[PDB]
Amino acid sequence: GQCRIQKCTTDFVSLTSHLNSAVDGFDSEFCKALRAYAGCTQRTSKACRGNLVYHSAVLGISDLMSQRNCSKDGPT
Amino acid sequence: QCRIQKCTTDFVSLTSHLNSAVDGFDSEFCKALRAYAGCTQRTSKACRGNLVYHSAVLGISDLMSQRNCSKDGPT
Amino acid sequence: LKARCSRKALHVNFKDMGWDDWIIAPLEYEAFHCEGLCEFPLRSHLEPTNHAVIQTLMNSMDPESTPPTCCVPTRLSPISILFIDSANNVVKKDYEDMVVESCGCR
Amino acid sequence: KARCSRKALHVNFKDMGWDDWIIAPLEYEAFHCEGLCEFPLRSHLEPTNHAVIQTLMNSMDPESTPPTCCVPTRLSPISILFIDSANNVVKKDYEDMVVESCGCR
Ligand SMILES: *[C@@H]1O[C@H](CO)[C@@H](O)[C@H](O)[C@H]1NC(C)=O
Ligand SMILES: [Cl-]
Ligand SMILES: [Cl-]
Ligand SMILES: [Cl-]
């Protein structure tokens, strides 16, 4: 009902905290988590309007997906 | 009154230009440390119980030991 | 070179971030940031907590027992943002803690 | 490569020689904060608006600003029994002696 960006972030952090670039599938698992994070943040966009945590999540997610070459469409 | 901040300001002012990569760091530092030690000793009684003071005294003493700055010497 | 804890420039351009689709004004502001060494002794204007006084002491005596304290904002000020809210209305609101006014070791 | 956390930090006043004026406690757990502040900051790191923006900008361009820093965001006092200047036994709360939470600022 309200702004729920913190849930999205918690999920993303929980899902990726262990990830280490020294292991094989880092980038794929990371991109999957990023797409899920992007989707979760998108679905709470209206309630979160004006919340800098929300707006920076949206932009930081988009930027990370560009940096890590994650397709916008793909598995989560 | 506890005047530790005067001692610290002086020490920081006097060493602010010091760059560890420049050739005379330790000698100017020790003179500065010795003056800092003297200043902190002159306000010791007023500063008992003041954590900034007690930390300064111990930090100075430790640095003078670490850097082998003699107890007495130019300031 | 390794500067001591200081307030440095940090320009925030909301238009470059694409946030002008909800922010009306300002579209940029000076946020500053804090950066630099927290060394023994902490100068009075770094305004340390008792904890930071002790940690800086301990890191000076034994840099392996504890890391140094960190140069972070110790006073911040708000900026007023005019934006389009969730109800699609113009809203003026103070955003607290947006501009670094002072840096210190914590 | 640990993320911002509260870590142990034991303070021993007797080892520091402060037992000539501190009566009790002669040691306490102060804790300290240490670790990476990475985008996205979890809620419990309680960033300021400024830290939110700085972490974002450092994520997008590490050259534009450094990351935010792991520091105590909540602290608690300890009661110290000591002798003051006038040889009075004093019991005083020393504020901000114990890290209760760490966060990114
Ligand atoms: C993303 O693609 C760019 C361009 O090929 C490359 O330089 C970069 O290393 C890639 N990063 C990842 C995480 O795949
Ligand atoms: Cl992908
Ligand atoms: Cl002398
Ligand atoms: Cl305005």
Author numbering:
A (entry chain D): 52 to 127
B (entry chain C): 53 to 127
C (entry chain B): 396 to 501
D (entry chain A): 397 to 501
Sentences from the paper on this structure:
To characterize the RGM–GDF5 interactions, we determined the crystal structure of RGMBND in complex with GDF5 at 1.7 Å resolution. In the complex, the disulfide-linked GDF5 dimer binds two RGMBND molecules that are related by a noncrystallographic pseudo twofold axis (RMSD of 0.21 Å for 143 equivalent Cα atoms of the 1:1 RGMB:GDF5 complexes). RGMBND forms a bundle of three α-helices stabilized by three disulfide bonds. It binds to the finger region of GDF5 and interacts with both GDF5 molecules of the dimer. The RGMBND–GDF5 interface comprises mixed charged and hydrophobic interactions (containing 116 nonbonded contacts and 5 hydrogen bonds) mediated by 20 residues from each binding partner and buries a total surface area of 1,929 Å2. The side-chain of RGMB Leu103 inserts into the hydrophobic pocket on GDF5 formed by Trp414, Trp417, Ile449, Tyr490, and Met493 and is shielded by a hydrogen bond formed by RGMB Gly101 (“RGD-loop”) and GDF5 Tyr490. A major interface is formed by the side-chain of RGMB His106 that stacks onto GDF5 Trp417. This π–π stacking is shielded from the solvent by RGMB Arg100. Our 1.7 Å crystal structure allowed us to identify a network of well-ordered water molecules contributing to the RGMB–GDF5 interactions. The side-chain of RGMB His106 forms a hydrogen bond with the amide of Gly101 from the “RGD-loop” and a water molecule that extends a hydrophilic network to Tyr105, Trp414, and Asp416 of GDF5.
Repulsive guidance molecules (RGMs) are cell surface proteins that control processes ranging from brain development to iron metabolism. RGMs can bind to the cell guidance receptor Neogenin (NEO1) and act as coreceptors for the bone morphogenetic proteins (BMPs). Structural analysis of RGMs and their complexes with NEO1 and BMP2 revealed a common RGM architecture comprising an N-terminal domain (RGMND) essential for BMP binding and a C-terminal domain (RGMCD) sufficient for NEO1 binding. Here, we determined high-resolution structures of all three human RGMs in complex with the BMP ligand growth differentiation factor 5 (GDF5) and the ternary complex of GDF5 with RGM and NEO1.
